[PDB]
């Protein structure tokens, strides 16, 4: 019985219920993430920005079933084109807007990766991606507004691939956490 999360802490408790088992009801997880109304005071602790690139701030480790993290995107900050390491990946906007560009998996032949579509993710929306859907890039294209997003990955993963848009070639990257549980982790 999915109820509206009243707070971030309530959302986290609900997520622990939704991930108690071995499978993932994607539509229910997405619905509960979308139903949480972002309250900046509840997540200010995790919203630690860096001047030069986006930061990943771990919020909850989901008792091993998922990583819940907050990403903080300065103006003009964006990601690589990347995969999600055979995990579910939910992305909910907490503040601002992000541009999501979707790409197909490259072929063996070296070729330019041409976007398949793009969309603007707005405040409180929750999007979803997995490797079966494709690859994506996420970018804060704003010149004036930092963006903050809440990401849930299940199972948790510490590495993924970045893809060269000019060729489709991929390189393994290790995810680093800027902070964990509100504590800066150099
Ligand atoms: Fe992603």
């Amino acid at each position: 019985e999915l109820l509206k999360p009243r707070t971030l802490a309530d959302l986290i408790r609900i997520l622990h219920e939704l991930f108690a088992g071995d499978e993932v009801n994607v539509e229910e997880v997405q619905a509960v993430l979308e139903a949480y109304e972002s309250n900046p005071a509840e997540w200010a602790l995790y919203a630690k920005f860096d001047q030069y690139r986006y930061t990943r701030n771990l919020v909850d480790q989901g008792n091993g079933k998922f990583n819940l993290m907050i990403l903080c995107w300065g103006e003009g900050h964006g990601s690589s084109i990347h995969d999600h390491t055979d995990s579910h990946c939910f992305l909910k906007l907490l503040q601002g807007n992000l541009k999501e560009t979707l790409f197909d998996w490259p072929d063996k032949k070296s070729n330019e990766m041409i976007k398949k579509s793009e969309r603007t993710l707005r405040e409180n929306q929750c999007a979803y991606i997995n490797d079966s859907i494709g690859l994506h890039r996420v970018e804060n294209v704003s010149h004036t507004e930092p963006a903050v997003s809440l990401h849930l990955y299940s199972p948790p993963f510490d590495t993924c691939h970045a893809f060269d848009q000019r060729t489709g070639h991929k390189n393994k990257v290790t995810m680093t956490f800027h902070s964990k549980f509100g504590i800066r982790t150099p």
Side-chain angles (χ1 to χ4, degrees), residues 1-5 7-107 109-179 181-186:
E1 201 81 316
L2 298 188
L3 296 175
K4 176 180 162 66
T7 65
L8 179 58
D10 199 41
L11 172 60
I12 292 170
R13 190 263 309 164
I14 290 157
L15 295 168
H16 278 253
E17 301 178 0
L18 293 172
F19 288 88
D22 289 331
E23 304 288 316
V24 175
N25 187 318
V26 169
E27 298 80 11
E28 289 188 351
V29 175
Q30 187 164 5
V32 307
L33 284 168
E34 180 118 1
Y36 166 59
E37 285 183 26
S38 179
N39 177 357
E42 292 172 1
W43 48 257
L45 178 63
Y46 310 109
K48 300 182 203 298
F49 286 76
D50 180 87
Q51 177 171 347
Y52 303 106
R53 58 153 286 192
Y54 74 93
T55 59
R56 300 179 173 272
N57 300 281
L58 187 62
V59 174
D60 195 83
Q61 282 177 309
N63 300 133
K65 286 286 181 49
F66 63 79
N67 276 339
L68 186 70
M69 60 190 75
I70 284 174
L71 272 63
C72 299
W73 312 80
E75 295 94 333
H77 289 177
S79 76
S80 61
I81 299 173
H82 60 271
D83 66 353
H84 297 87
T85 311
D86 286 303
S87 290
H88 301 281
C89 184
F90 303 81
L91 193 169
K92 182 211 174 60
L93 265 290
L94 296 179
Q95 175 182 295
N97 300 278
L98 294 165
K99 180 171 79 160
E100 181 189 37
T101 305
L102 300 187
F103 293 87
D104 284 322
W105 282 90
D107 296 314
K109 197 171 185 179
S110 165
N111 273 320
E112 172 88 19
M113 305 178 68
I114 299 300
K115 63 190 180 187
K116 76 160 74 96
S117 60
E118 71 180 48
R119 59 168 162 172
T120 297
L121 302 176
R122 305 199 177 276
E123 178 190 87
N124 281 309
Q125 179 177 357
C126 188
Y128 173 72
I129 194 162
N130 65 39
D131 288 347
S132 80
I133 291 168
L135 307 172
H136 72 178
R137 188 194 298 280
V138 176
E139 299 173 281
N140 183 10
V141 300
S142 182
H143 285 82
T144 54
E145 292 300 344
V148 182
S149 50
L150 178 67
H151 299 232
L152 187 165
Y153 298 120
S154 186
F157 59 91
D158 33 42
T159 70
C160 72
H161 297 98
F163 296 73
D164 175 5
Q165 187 174 357
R166 307 284 79 77
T167 63
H169 296 159
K170 70 182 161 54
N171 291 98
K172 198 173 182 190
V173 176
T174 297
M175 183 171 71
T176 56
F177 287 119
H178 190 72
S179 67
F181 317 117
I183 305 298
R184 178 75 176 90
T185 53

